[PDB]
Amino acid sequence: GIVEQCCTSICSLYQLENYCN
Amino acid sequence: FVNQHLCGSHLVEALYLVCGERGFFYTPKA
């Protein structure tokens, strides 16, 4: 999930945009 | 500003700034 990819590990714009509507 | 550890309200803020008018979905337990 987003926590595993952006909190416990370093986030990225690619990852963040996957969560935009 | 997105290339770092973003947790909790910090992560929610990042999504808010990046997604804009598109909005987003926050699913912590995924």
Curated annotation (Swiss-Prot), chain A:
This is Insulin A chain. Disulfide bonds join C6-C11. The chain holds residues 88 to 108 of 108 of the full protein. It comes from the Eukaryota. The lineage of its organism: Eukaryota, Metazoa, Chordata, Craniata, Vertebrata. It comes from Sus scrofa (Pig).
